[PDB]
Design a protein around this nucleic acid. Structure first.
Ligand SMILES: [Zn+2]
Ligand SMILES: [Zn+2]
Lengths: 147, 123, 50, 160
RNA sequence: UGAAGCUUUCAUACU
RNA sequence: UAGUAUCUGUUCUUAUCAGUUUAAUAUCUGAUUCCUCGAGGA
């Protein structure tokens, strides 16, 4: 059968390792399985709300890039909320139409009353897209900067 | 670590009596073949040496005990109790500000994990 | 439940050997006692004297 | 346990006499032990080498640390974010220093260990200060090239 | 972790 | 034909000493009112 205790030795006689027993044929082993010894040996071995309420009118954003050396400026209107716009780097493998030859990355900045503005980065790593590291959001002038 | 702490205390005591920022008793000792690795800001002991120099500068204040005598902290337990209550109120305000900053960070993390990342627009 | 009368009589059991070097720990049947001198507790008891 | 050195990061090419032959130049390795698995019946990558003196085990731990044996990061040692497939050559302080570049750590991290050997199990758990450091670890560190071992950072608990 | 002995009405195999 | 072996079944108070015997066990031979729900156990 499929039980690991039943096996075939080099001699070819059947043998139950669970009971340490030898049987001449299959019927003797099956009669041993119904016996007290095999049952006792087996008994011994037995032991969402914020995403749906977000308004999307998709206004026209104003991004200004500048090649620095040692940084993009996004002009956004007044949102009147404490939620800062967040930037994140994603891949071009997921799209609404999935165009061919998409093997680059895109850093996109998104806010709640405005639409996300995305910029493609052909380079591998030239900066850091972390939010708390190299980003700033002045709510007095409503200016977003990321370097 | 007692000898290094004593050397740092001696450097903080000798640097606090200087009349300028670079004209001290430790800048000329660096050119006098005396090895002092605690003067450079790259070491971790420099942050403790700066605090020791700040304490030595605050021990030279005119109400620190050089030409005046403190009467409110030395002869008024009610003023010390009011200062302890003000410090406890400042600690409670700092804890409330930290809780508000943690709540704002949690709100920003909830807003960032619910926005649509598939609406890409390249202008 | 209790062990079968064969396990209790065939296995040298019902006879207990005690050892002062081992906290007067009373051991069971012939085979179990022989291993005891090699086991941890007896080594511990012997280290007490050095 | 003091005279024995626990080795981690062994591939299928490494064997029980092979580790004793490789550790023979470091010191007199008296015995080698490799615990076999129950489902596969082979070594799980972690083994032990019991030498004669503790100085030979210290020299083997200081010489064969973070080595590339059989295409595997073998290292000898003294015998809500989840990181998997981590190298055993790194310690808790090394993992805290590696995690300090992304974000701030709340406390000292802990690494899971095997109940038999106790050197390295294969997975570790680390907690960040805020969710921004966890997102930066899931964006950058989840897939970064570690010391000859591709690690994988994931969230331990998330609510839909 | 382990110790499977003794007996017959069994029943089954080999000499 | 009549011998052996292997499965199945049975396998003898967690109450105390002495004698025969045993390597030691084992075996054999002798001594040592109350509780529970008319009933059972000690
Ligand atoms: Zn069986
Ligand atoms: Zn003993």
């Amino acid at each position: 059968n499929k039980d690991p205790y039943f096996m075939k030795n080099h001699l070819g006689s059947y043998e139950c390792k669970l009971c340490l027993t030898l049987h001449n044929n299959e019927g003797s082993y099956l009669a041993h399985t119904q016996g007290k010894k095999h049952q006792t040996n087996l008994a011994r071995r037995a032991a969402v709300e914020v995403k749906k309420f977000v308004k999307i009118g998709r206004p026209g954003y104003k991004v200004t890039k500048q090649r620095d050396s040692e940084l993009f400026q996004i002009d956004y209107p007044e949102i009147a909320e404490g939620i800062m716009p967040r930037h994140r780097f994603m891949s071009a493998y997921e799209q609404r139409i999935e165009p061919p030859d998409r093997r680059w990355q895109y850093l996109l900045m998104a806010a709640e009353p405005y639409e996300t503005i995305a910029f493609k980065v052909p380079s591998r790593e030239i900066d850091k897209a972390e939010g708390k590291f190299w980003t700033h959001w002045n709510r007095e002038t409503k200016q977003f900067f990321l370097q | 670590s007692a000898f290094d702490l004593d050397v740092v205390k001696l450097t903080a005591q000798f640097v606090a009596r200087n009349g300028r920022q670079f004209l001290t008793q430790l800048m000329q000792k660096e050119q006098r073949n005396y090895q002092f690795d605690f003067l450079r800001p790259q070491h971790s002991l420099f942050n403790y040496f700066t605090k020791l120099v700040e304490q030595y500068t605050k021990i030279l204040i005119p109400p620190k005990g050089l030409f005046s005598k403190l009467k409110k902290e030395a002869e008024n337990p009610r003023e010390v109790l009011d200062q302890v209550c003000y410090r406890v109120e400042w600690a409670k305000f700092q804890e409330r500000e930290r809780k508000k900053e943690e709540e704002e960070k949690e709100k920003e993390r909830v807003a960032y994990a619910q926005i649509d990342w598939h609406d890409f627009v390249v202008v | 439940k209790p062990i079968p009368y064969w396990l209790y009589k065939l296995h040298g059991l019902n006879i207990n050997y005690n050892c002062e070097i081992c906290g007067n720990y009373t051991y069971r049947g012939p085979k179990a006692f022989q291993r005891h001198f090699a086991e941890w507790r007896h080594a511990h008891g012997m280290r007490c004297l050095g | 346990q003091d005279a024995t050195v626990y080795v981690g990061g062994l591939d299928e090419k490494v064997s029980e006499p092979l580790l004793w032959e490789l550790f023979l130049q470091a010191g007199p390795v008296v015995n080698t032990h490799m615990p076999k698995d129950r489902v596969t019946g082979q070594h799980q990558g972690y083994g032990f080498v019991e030498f004669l003196s503790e100085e030979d085990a210290d020299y083997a731990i200081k010489i064969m640390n973070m080595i590339k044996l059989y295409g595997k990061p073998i290292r000898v040692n003294k015998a809500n974010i989840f990181i998997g497939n981590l190298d055993p050559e790194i310690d808790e302080k090394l993992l805290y220093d590696t995690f300090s570049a992304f974000g701030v750590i709340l406390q000292t991290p802990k690494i899971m260990r095997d109940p038999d050997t106790g050197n390295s199990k294969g997975y570790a758990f680390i907690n960040f200060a805020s969710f921004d450091a966890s997102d930066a670890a899931i964006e950058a560190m989840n897939g970064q090239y570690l010391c000859n071992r591709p690690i994988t950072v994931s969230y331990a608990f998330k609510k839909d």
